[PDB]
Amino acid sequence: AQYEDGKQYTTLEKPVAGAPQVLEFFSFFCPHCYQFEEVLHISDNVKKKLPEGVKMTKYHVNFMGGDLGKDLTQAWAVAMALGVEDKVTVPLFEGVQKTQTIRSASDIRDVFINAGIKGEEYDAAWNSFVVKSLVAQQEKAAADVQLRGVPAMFVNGKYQLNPQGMDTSNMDVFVQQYADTVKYLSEK
């Protein structure tokens, strides 16, 4: 076939019931994730090729960056609760990997403040039980697929994108192949 299990994707031996339609996992410590966001804009290009009403979910993971990794998963939960993902994603990536100005939870907070989220509003969210459940959700979903690597994308809790098996001489061709694969898996 043109799309083969084990080539542009792999199949989970243990499919995940009730999983989000399109589920992406990343870490702000993850170098290919930085590329996926800043240079390739994967999420957005998948969205553009997805059908009628497909929700896209993106979660942060704990297994990179020790104590700051966990802070970042809580911060992403805040970002999700407040709906400010598109305002903090880039400065968090650059703060962790480019300028290396993020070294504590307080530095993460500074990113939100400078993006215009208010102190009170950040601190209340940070401490809210709604953000706690949201952190739980991120951990659960990663745990449901035994995730030991990022970036990762899962479709309908049954298929996992395999970018290693796609062409990388051309960045744009890579992204389109990636997105076309998500759409193929979507209609599977």
Side-chain angles (χ1 to χ4, degrees):
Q2 290 271 352
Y3 293 102
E4 278 163 1
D5 182 284
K7 186 65 223 156
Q8 298 103 329
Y9 67 97
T10 51
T11 300
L12 300 180
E13 276 156 26
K14 235 173 178 294
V16 169
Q21 243 140 225
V22 178
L23 185 52
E24 204 173 329
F25 292 95
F26 78 111
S27 167
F28 285 109
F29 282 95
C30 160
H32 282 142
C33 302
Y34 187 110
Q35 291 303 306
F36 265 39
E37 167 67 26
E38 301 267 300
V39 182
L40 303 171
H41 308 282
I42 292 285
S43 295
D44 175 46
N45 277 276
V46 170
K47 189 179 174 179
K48 287 194 289 78
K49 289 211 162 153
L50 286 184
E52 38 281 6
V54 188
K55 80 166 303 193
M56 286 187 84
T57 311
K58 172 139 77 192
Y59 288 156
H60 198 267
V61 294
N62 290 338
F63 63 80
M64 293 185 80
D67 210 284
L68 260 191
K70 287 213 76 174
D71 277 329
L72 281 164
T73 304
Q74 194 164 344
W76 188 245
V78 170
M80 286 189 289
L82 297 179
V84 296
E85 294 93 324
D86 300 334
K87 297 168 172 191
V88 292
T89 286
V90 165
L92 282 171
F93 266 117
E94 298 192 355
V96 178
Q97 300 188 49
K98 193 184 173 176
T99 55
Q100 296 177 0
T101 45
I102 290 175
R103 308 202 214 87
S104 67
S106 176
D107 302 338
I108 300 179
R109 185 175 184 276
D110 286 345
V111 171
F112 284 69
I113 303 297
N114 180 66
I117 295 84
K118 289 174 205 351
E120 24 182 356
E121 181 176 33
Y122 181 87
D123 299 342
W126 182 268
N127 288 293
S128 71
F129 282 91
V130 169
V131 151
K132 297 203 196 320
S133 61
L134 226 30
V135 167
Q137 285 170 235
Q138 296 183 87
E139 298 185 13
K140 176 157 189 288
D144 280 348
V145 293
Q146 288 188 303
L147 191 74
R148 101 196 74 151
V150 287
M153 187 184 287
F154 293 90
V155 181
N156 285 316
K158 221 186 171 334
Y159 305 105
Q160 177 176 2
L161 273 286
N162 168 50
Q164 286 102 325
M166 316 177 183
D167 296 298
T168 66
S169 68
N170 182 312
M171 300 177 116
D172 301 308
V173 168
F174 170 76
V175 179
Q176 291 308 25
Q177 186 178 358
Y178 196 99
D180 287 343
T181 301
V182 177
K183 175 180 190 292
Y184 159 79
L185 293 176
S186 199
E187 305 152 353
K188 220 182 164 85

